[PDB]
Assembly symmetry: D2
């Protein structure tokens, strides 16, 4: 099983990708055992990025690692196909697209044709990014099988039955959960890993949760998993998407600039308050020799 970071995109004060902070972040993440980096995801504000900006992200992260899943999707199929084609000259794990989001009641036939279209032009494996909270509609194990060309799936449904059905109908598919809270469980139930936003700021915890469970130390796995759950809960208070920047600086030492409005940075009051709820958790994580002071 793997831990995959949907990598944050650091921005400058004038709203440009801070390529160097992104490179520092990716290097740290690989160093602490993250297997692969999911680029231009929700957590990286992928939807807020121009195609050119999606390309810089890949190019900047690619300076650090070839263990990239390159998310190219959007509401303009022509931009996504072109980004897919640009990836030919990169040694990467795959590209990815979500279903067209926002738009309700698109025909399944059009959904299937959309994805088969990406597969037809793609020079790399194609991963389904099934994010129904964001998109509204679901691409379940049956539609995935109907499309027939997915190498893997990121399932942001928390109902793990839904996720397992992908293995059941697509025994050859790689199947990841998008939940930081199911690292222990996913590993123990034979699934392929998690695409965990929280591995941005606690890669060590997420990798260790996975290793404990696979070492069949399920009880220790859960005790650490439940601590991780508490950090995840804290981050939602002010907007997980903003708070993820604060928690990376706090747990990992380097800052990631600003987010992209309308994802506003936490003001100084909010930053203080957030750390208060994780102070104890940091301490404990040092206490177990999982983090270095």
């Amino acid at each position: 099983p793997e831990i995959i970071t949907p990598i944050i995109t650091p921005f400058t004060k004038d709203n440009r990708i801070d390529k160097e902070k992104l490179k520092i972040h990716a290097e740290n993440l690989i160093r602490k055992g993250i297997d692969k980096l999911f680029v231009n995801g929700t957590t990286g504000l992928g939807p807020s990025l121009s195609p050119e900006e999606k390309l810089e992200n890949l190019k900047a992260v690619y300076d650090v690692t070839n263990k990239i899943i390159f998310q190219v999707g959007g509401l303009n199929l022509d931009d996504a196909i072109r980004l897919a084609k640009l990836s030919k000259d990169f040694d990467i794990v795959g590209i990815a697209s979500y279903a067209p989001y926002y738009y309700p009641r698109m025909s399944e036939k059009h959904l299937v044709k959309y994805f088969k279209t990406l597969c037809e032009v793609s020079p790399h494996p194609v991963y389904l990014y099934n994010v129904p909270t964001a998109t509204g509609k679901d691409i379940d194990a049956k539609v995935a099988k109907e499309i027939g060309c997915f190498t893997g799936v990121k399932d942001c449904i928390e109902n793990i039955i839904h996720t397992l059905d992908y293995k059941r109908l697509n025994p050859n598919m790689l199947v990841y959960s998008g939940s930081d809270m199911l690292i222990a469980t996913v590993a123990s139930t034979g699934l392929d890993g998690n695409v965990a936003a929280g591995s941005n700021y606690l890669p060590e915890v997420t990798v260790t949760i996975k290793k404990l469970a696979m070492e069949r130390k399920i009880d220790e796995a859960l005790k650490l998993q439940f601590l991780h759950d508490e950090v995840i809960e804290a981050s939602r208070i002010f907007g997980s998407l903003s708070s993820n920047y604060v928690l990376t600086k706090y747990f990992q030492g380097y800052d990631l600039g600003y987010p992209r409005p309308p994802i506003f940075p936490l003001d100084d009051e909010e930053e203080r308050q957030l750390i208060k709820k994780v102070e104890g958790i940091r301490a404990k994580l040092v206490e177990l020799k999982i983090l270095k002071e």
Copy 2:
């Protein structure tokens, strides 16, 4: 009360905005009794448009009428501010924004700052585009009051209690429904109207329902509303976003070019079957002297 058309955006075969077919459509819509034009909405693939295209749409439509609501939102607040300011030199009803879509668990604090910022730079009245199905997030009557600068709301919730709450908590506020099926009901219950996608292809029906209800001939209004309902339902069989092109052509004579993939145009057999579903209705609407042959 009014009928407002979220105007379709017609595309060329090479996927650019067809300004000539937009202008034709906008002229027709205004002639047939449509009160205002909602530009860059869902139905027009607003979110599939670049900031520049969103402005193209404003400019093209503005050659025909100034009775325009200009949607400018997106996942880059800087882009929306730029379109908002640029609008100052157009004499329009107002600007509009959906909530930042896709992103779940944005702070309520941060959502308010998004809209209040938008109000601070806007040269026109600012309208709330409340689309919980696309965004997952709800901007209800309470939150709309906290923001406190909305001249009006378009509520894409079909539960009209929720729609009425806007008028209860913001009595000076204009409150429209986004539902084609609540035209009769909206006009008679003291709300300000409907932003009806179906007025793209049957503005005669939607204006007539509206007038009958104003005239308190509710029985007749409902008779027509229910035929329109049957048309709305037909459009969903093959994808409503693509069917809206086919239905504008059939009922109104002129064609609207192409949608923007991944909203793919219906194929000949899908188009065939769609007409079969509304053939009888076109007749009864002609017979009723609402539509000319």
Copy 3:
């Protein structure tokens, strides 16, 4: 259009139906213009009643009025059929049943057969009590038409599109909303009325909201409707089902005993707090000569 009270069942301290308080309540309600009384509903704790207790309720209320809808449904079809048969010797408007509740994924075919079964043995008109929040599954306008024997429906869906579809597919069916908040709207849009729990304690308001709208005073209708909405909201704070007893004593003068555990009575702190939020509203209602001091 009508206002129908889903009548509260008053209980004694030792958990028996207080027949006399129920008779006092029903007499008051009829006196203040409630058209019909829906007996053994949610608000009357119908599900908490034995078949014998359902029968006493009918018999006690029948001493006051023949304008009764007698709800007989439950999870034992044999009890409900027998109660249906007992109604033969009563001049009443109808019986009613909800879909079997609690139980998820019952076949539609079994649902249709359940309702057609009640119609086959029923000596009175049968009303569909469509309460999906309570039951989970929905009996929409299409299933209603398939069953084909319903004289009316109580639709506790707040999505008024859902309700209107019953008229559209069953033009001859009586169609009521279960919402206190849509009295104004239901009347103005040509529907048949509301089954409004809040008419238990403010019958005068609910009847007046309806009359104003039908007098085409829609703006006054809404101003009173929005006041009524505020009383409805208050009642949910502690449990609408408990609070309804307090508000009847407070607005109408007589008490209704206790509810049935696990619907516990409001303690003295909760009773004080609830009245505080309606004090002003009572005052105002006197100010308009709608209530008598």
Copy 4:
């Protein structure tokens, strides 16, 4: 971890509890490796049973084993207290209650008093039967801690994050899933087991999956889980509550009489088609030497 059967209640042709067929079934279930028996649940039409019948069920099953959880909840707290006390003379695992079903918007305060009262009079451990689909109301990990007297929880939510939260906030608490499809997953992630309706008709499968997962042969566990999943899905085609009777007969040899209308028994053609859906699976399960011919 354990498999717990929410035992079917067999009925006669005249709609009384068939004590002889219940005892046969209960004996078989215990012989085939079932750990405990959950009595008067959904699957047994608990809610269709009078308090007296709920006790009949206790007594009948208690002739076979004392490894019983006795469901006593209902919409009359007095009835549940009476069954709770009466249980004192049986040496059973514990009693159980769903939340008062049907009633929405009961105060959280009042829900806690319901369960805490139940604990105050109970002579046995009290189990939480959390069924949000039937009740609409959720008793989550947080609320279960506030009540604070639950020895265990059966969670009928399919989102296992929510299930794990019970163990995180109540580490001494036994936490079971109500899902047949999460047997493999539940046993391997450190939870205490599954209350699986499907163990009525395939206890060999559910016990075998459980053991394979204990033995960390997760790959094999999942292979069998997915066949069981296909069986679960088949049972839903015609109504799972009625199909559970047909499937107990087919796989286990003995029949269970009749369900209680309005859970109607499948007709010959529905039964015909159901077997066709599980014919192949019966074979593969025999072939696999999990089921005898």
